[PDB]
Ligand binder design. Structure first.
Ligand SMILES: *[C@@H]1O[C@H](CO)[C@@H](O)[C@H](O)[C@H]1NC(C)=O
Ligand SMILES: *[C@@H]1O[C@H](CO)[C@@H](O)[C@H](O)[C@H]1NC(C)=O
Ligand SMILES: *[C@@H]1O[C@H](CO)[C@@H](O)[C@H](O)[C@H]1NC(C)=O
Ligand SMILES: *[C@@H]1O[C@H](CO)[C@@H](O)[C@H](O)[C@H]1NC(C)=O
Ligand SMILES: [Cl-]
Lengths: 96, 597
């Protein structure tokens, strides 16, 4: 939980997330989309009545519930593929 | 493609914008109400103007969605709550005239002054002055003068203005497909589209009339007892069969009979429960009071409290440099920011008031995840009732003994519980007929059933027939005495109190049954039970996205208001009081009046 650094009064309006995309994403994909969504029929241009801007804001304040609390998440991924390993754990031993 | 999805997108936008706007508005109100300056007034005026403009803009923009093409209930509730334009359906001219007449109602009621007939320059306001006059003075002449001066000063000014108020409100209600303003007010309890939970607009009138019918006998017995005590105190002013005078009921309008306690105390010699000596002896302060209530709320398993409330809320009077208006109010600023404001003193009354305020905060915090348009009680009457049930629980002497405020050597007996129940009856039983008759009378006035030239006459006829209250000096149609009340003159519904009285006792009975208590309903304690807390939470999380009937059933299992808890709680009181009333006349005569000799 990050409640001291990634929190501020008067609301935190800096963090984003996306709720609209044409289809499902593929694993480990980056998509900085700027196009406007379309519902099913209109040749709409711009922010139409059925065409919206697909970016929202993570409104944050330090008086939030635990379930809604802005948790800091980092994921670590490894690959067990046969190749020369460059990073490995340390080990140390006794005296001579 | 469909209009439902466009409605979902519109509500999604409105929720996130209105959260910030309402937060700024409520923060301005919070910095004004506690800290009274002139620039904070300007800041609140600006914030409120922005909030009202936003509400009007959203209503105008979302009026183009017809409600006939919505399926899932959640959205339909949001759109119905949003679409109510209120006064905006009326033309601009009559709307502004209405807002001015409302402002004059507020100014006249707040600044109303009455002067004694011996000193023109010495005049008294109501809350600072007449309140104390009719709450402490035992002099008949002084109470009569306070009643008559206040009424003759406010009602004559407020009568034609109330008439045009009723006309404009009826016109606006007819514009909004309502037969009368009474129907507009009754629409709060309205629900549709849910099978097995429907509720009609006349159903409210029917059930309230039935409940008053079943509650009548205890009120009449208490009236007989109070009348006997009053003739014991005042032999030459009250008839053995006639109705009680209005200005002998403890307050300005007969709303509460809490003052008359000393008159109807059964054992003036039996000690009364009070732990202010316990707080001063143990050096209790506001922080310890609120921590004690914190642990009381934790005892049932409710969610334990947050940091910002303790850090930023003022739990004490802010000295004399800054002056605060500290009526007990729980503030939900939105976005998880909950706050409290009241000038805390070391008194048991403040202990119960704090428990009530924390109960409101607990309710407010329970539905924090609910969207912006629905973050409110299932109806209007669930907030206060939930706040008052906690104070009722904390007032039990068992809890006081448990938390080390009352000595374990204290001997509970029949007389002490009879005294406590008489106190509770004087605060509760006295106000039910007043609330019922007041709201009902306004309903007929709104319905327009009573012609203009007999409003006061019919009002007093109802009072003498059903409430047992008769005026001491006759009044003509130029008076507007009902408007001499805070709720009547400032556009508030009054039935809320009757429904709250029923709901709080229904909840108390249900939770006490769930608590497995072996003893009198009034001795019941709800701590030690996380099952009761879970039962309370099962409705606390609901809010009002679902019909109020379902929320009530989730607690008591009943889909309608019932009077069984109220009669069961006061049953020992009822049997003792009927034991007393064997030698006194039961009922009242409407013909007798103090001014008729
Ligand atoms: C006094 O007024 C200021 C003005 O914003 C406010 O910030 C402060 O909280 C007030 N003091 C209180 C509420 O105790
Ligand atoms: C309403 O929405 C809920 C939650 O998504 C869903 O479970 C339910 O089937 C919907 N009902 C209708 C009538 O669309
Ligand atoms: C916090 O609340 C839970 C119930 O929600 C309760 O089990 C726990 O005892 C509370 N915390 C403390 C310190 O009592
Ligand atoms: C008090 O605590 C324990 C809980 O197991 C038990 O003696 C008793 O059931 C509790 N009292 C009530 C009223 O639940
Ligand atoms: Cl009436």
């Amino acid at each position: 939980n990050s409640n001291k650094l990634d929190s501020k009064h008067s609301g935190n309006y800096d963090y984003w997330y996306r709720l609209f995309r044409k289809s499902k994403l593929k694993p480990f994909e980056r998509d900085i989309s700027t196009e406007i969504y379309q519902a099913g029929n209109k040749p709409c241009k711009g922010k139409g009545p059925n065409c919206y801007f697909p970016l929202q804001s993570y409104g944050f304040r330090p008086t939030y519930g635990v379930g809604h609390q802005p948790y800091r998440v980092v994921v670590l991924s490894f690959e067990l593929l046969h190749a020369p390993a460059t990073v490995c754990g340390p080990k140390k031993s006794t005296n001579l | 493609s469909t209009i439902e999805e466009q409605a979902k997108t519109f509500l999604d936008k409105f929720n996130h914008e209105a959260e910030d706007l309402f937060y700024q508005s409520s923060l301005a109100s919070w910095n004004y109400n506690t800290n009274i300056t002139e620039e904070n007034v300007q800041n609140m005026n600006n914030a409120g103007d922005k909030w009202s403009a936003f509400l009007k803009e959203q209503s105008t923009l979302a009026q183009m969605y017809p409600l006939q093409e919505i399926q899932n209930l959640t959205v339909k509730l949001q759109l119905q709550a949003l679409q109510q334009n209120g006064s905006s359906v009326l033309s601009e001219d009559k709307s502004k005239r209405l807002n001015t007449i409302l402002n004059t109602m507020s100014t006249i009621y707040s600044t109303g002054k009455v002067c004694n007939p011996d000193n023109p320059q010495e005049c008294l306001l109501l809350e600072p002055g007449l309140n104390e006059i009719m709450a402490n003075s035992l002099d008949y002449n002084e109470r009569l003068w306070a009643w008559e001066s206040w009424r003759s000063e406010v009602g004559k000014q407020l009568r034609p203005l109330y008439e045009e108020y009723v006309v404009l409100k009826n016109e606006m209600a007819r514009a909004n497909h309502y037969e009368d303003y009474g129907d507009y007010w009754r629409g709060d309890y309205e629900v549709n589209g849910v099978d097995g939970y429907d509720y009609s607009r006349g159903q409210l009138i029917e059930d309230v009339e039935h409940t008053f019918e079943e509650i009548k006998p205890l009120y009449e017995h208490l009236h007989a007892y109070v009348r006997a005590k009053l003739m014991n105190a005042y032999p030459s002013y009250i008839s053995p069969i006639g109705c009680l005078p209005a200005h002998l009921l403890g307050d300005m309008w007969g709303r509460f009979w809490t003052n008359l306690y000393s008159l109807t105390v059964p054992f003036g010699q039996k000690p009364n429960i009070d732990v202010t000596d316990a707080m001063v002896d143990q050096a209790w302060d506001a922080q310890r009071i609120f921590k004690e209530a914190e642990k009381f709320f934790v005892s049932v398993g409710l969610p334990n409290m947050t940091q910002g409330f303790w850090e930023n809320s003022m739990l004490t009077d802010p000295g004399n440099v800054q002056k605060a208006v500290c009526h007990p109010t729980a503030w939900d600023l939105g976005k998880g920011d909950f706050r409290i404001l009241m000038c805390t003193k070391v008194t048991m009354d403040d202990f119960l008031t704090a428990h009530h305020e924390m109960g409101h905060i607990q309710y407010d915090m329970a539905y924090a995840a609910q969207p912006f348009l629905l973050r409110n009680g299932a109806n209007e009457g669930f907030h206060e009732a939930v706040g008052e049930i906690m104070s009722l629980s904390a007032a039990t002497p068992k809890h006081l003994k448990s938390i080390g405020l009352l000595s374990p050597d204290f001997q509970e007996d029949n007389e002490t519980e009879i005294n406590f129940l008489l106190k509770q009856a004087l605060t509760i039983v006295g106000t039910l007929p007043f609330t019922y008759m007041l709201e009902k009378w306004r309903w007929m006035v709104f319905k327009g059933e009573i012609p203009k030239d007999q409003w006061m006459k019919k009002w007093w006829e109802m009072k003498r027939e059903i409430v047992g209250v008769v005026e001491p000096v006759p009044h003509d149609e130029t008076y507007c005495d009902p408007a001499s009340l805070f709720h009547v003159s400032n556009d508030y519904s009054f039935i809320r109190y009757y429904t709250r009285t029923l709901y709080q006792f229904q909840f108390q009975e249900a939770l006490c049954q769930a608590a497995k208590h072996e003893g009198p309903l009034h001795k019941c304690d709800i701590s030690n039970s996380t099952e009761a807390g879970q039962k309370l939470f099962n409705m606390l999380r609901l809010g009002k996205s679902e019909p109020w009937t379902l929320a009530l059933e989730n607690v008591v299992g009943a889909k309608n208001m019932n009077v069984r808890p109220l009669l069961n709680y006061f049953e020992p009181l009822f049997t003792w009081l009927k034991d007393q009333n064997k030698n006194s006349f039961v009922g009242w005569s409407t013909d007798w009046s103090p001014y008729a000799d």
